[PDB]
Write a protein that binds this ligand. Structure first.
Ligand SMILES: Nc1ccn([C@H]2C[C@H](O)[C@@H](COP(=O)(O)NP(=O)(O)OP(=O)(O)O)O2)c(=O)n1
Ligand SMILES: [Mg+2]
Ligand SMILES: [Mg+2]
Ligand code: NA
Ligand code: NA
Length: 326
DNA sequence: CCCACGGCCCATCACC
DNA sequence: GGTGATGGGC
DNA sequence: GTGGG
């Protein structure tokens, strides 16, 4: 974090544009510039120096010049003093409350943590849980604990069926010493791009994790994606662990590599790799990589036998998980 | 100067 | 109930 | 907010 001051500012600007302005491309623009600056190995001495990087234009250069001279940004000082912006920004930190619901709550006078707790009935299920574990969801997860959770999930899934393969992805797979949540990619031989030869493959895994009281809540649940809450078990007299967010994604087994590429991330790395794919004449999702015709309609899935194959198609030298933290 | 900005699962809602 | 848009999120 | 064509 040579330029922590700058990337903090841009991130705060990104969050403002997303939550308050509801201008999602300004949000992406700021997080993009913040990302490319974060890996810049020198201590930026000027906005013009920053402008040389792809993603940093004139406006951000100006803001960097102001920040380096005064240590702060007036655009942000103002935003920080607005009640509406502060209320809306706070509300969006509750899982299940997006920019729209946040602004709508404020119109009704519901703008504090106490307001949410007294008005539980005006929340849907996701928001109710997000409020419930608002404190825990602010806490990060030490890799030490991620290791415990990994072993539990993997052993529980082995117990359901020895042919399930569960892989922890996300920031954990990228080698982070701390994670915001747990991300699990799941495969089973019965579920391929060809056919689902067995119903409820994800349900049974969730069921099992619920019966050992690992999974405690459910935010959403379909045939391929689980979004919910989990908690490590504690020993006698030992104070309980915080509740953690957990994401489980069931992917067709023959499409494991695109799946594990996708959910390893990061989100910004994924954005960059797929944009580059489009430039190179391909399109990548969590299932396949396809060519673009002169048309703009995708062709057939190209053969993929590894993560490196995907990198190869678009003329990218392979980058290990720990070098994908953009 | 113009425009597109990665790709998609689940919950909810509007409409027929 | 089917379909499609929208919100929130990965 | 930024940048390729
Ligand atoms: N916008 C997004 C968000 C997530 N993802 C994929 C890549 C992420 O690594 C993976 C999990 O999302 P995530 O849990 O919100 N972020 P991630 O695990 O990378 O970092 P953490 O904050 O969880 O530690 O989903 C994506 O492709 N596009
Ligand atoms: Mg994660
Ligand atoms: Mg996640
Ligand atoms: Na630039
Ligand atoms: Na939220």
């Amino acid at each position: 974090t040579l330029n922590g001051g700058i990337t903090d500012m841009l991130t705060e600007l990104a969050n403002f544009e997303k939550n308050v302005s509801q201008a999602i491309h300004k949000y992406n623009a700021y997080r993009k510039a913040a990302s490319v600056i974060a890996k810049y190995p020198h201590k930026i001495k000027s906005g013009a120096e920053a402008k040389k990087l792809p993603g940093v234009g004139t406006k951000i250069a100006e803001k960097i010049d102001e920040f380096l001279a005064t240590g702060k940004l007036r655009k942000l000082e103002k935003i920080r003093q607005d009640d509406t912006s502060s209320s809306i920004n706070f509300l969006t930190r509750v899982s299940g409350i997006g920019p729209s619901a946040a602004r709508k709550f404020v119109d009704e006078g519901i703008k504090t943590l106490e307001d949410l707790r007294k008005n539980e009935d005006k929340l849907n299920h996701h928001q109710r849980i997000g409020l419930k574990y608002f404190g825990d969801f602010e806490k990060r997860i030490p890799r030490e604990e991620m290791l415990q959770m990994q072993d539990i999930v993997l052993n529980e899934v082995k117990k359901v069926d020895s042919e399930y393969i569960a892989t922890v992805c996300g920031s954990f797979r990228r080698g982070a010493e701390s994670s915001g949540d747990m991300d699990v990619l799941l495969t089973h031989p019965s579920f391929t791009s060809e056919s689902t030869k067995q119903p409820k493959l994800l349900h049974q895994v969730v069921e099992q994790l619920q019966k050992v009281h690992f999974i405690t809540d459910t935010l959403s649940k379909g045939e391929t994606k689980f979004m919910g809450v989990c908690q490590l078990p504690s020993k006698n007299d030992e104070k309980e662990y915080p509740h953690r967010r957990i994401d489980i994604r069931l992917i067709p087994k023959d499409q494991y590599y695109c799946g594990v590429l996708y959910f390893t991330g990061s989100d910004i790395f994924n954005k960059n790799m797929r944009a580059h794919a489009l430039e190179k004449g391909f399109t990548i999702n969590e299932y396949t990589i396809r060519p673009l015709g002169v048309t703009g309609v995708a062709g057939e899935p190209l053969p993929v036998d590894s993560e490196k194959d995907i990198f190869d198609y678009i003329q990218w030298k392979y980058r290990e998980p720990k070098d994908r933290s953009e």
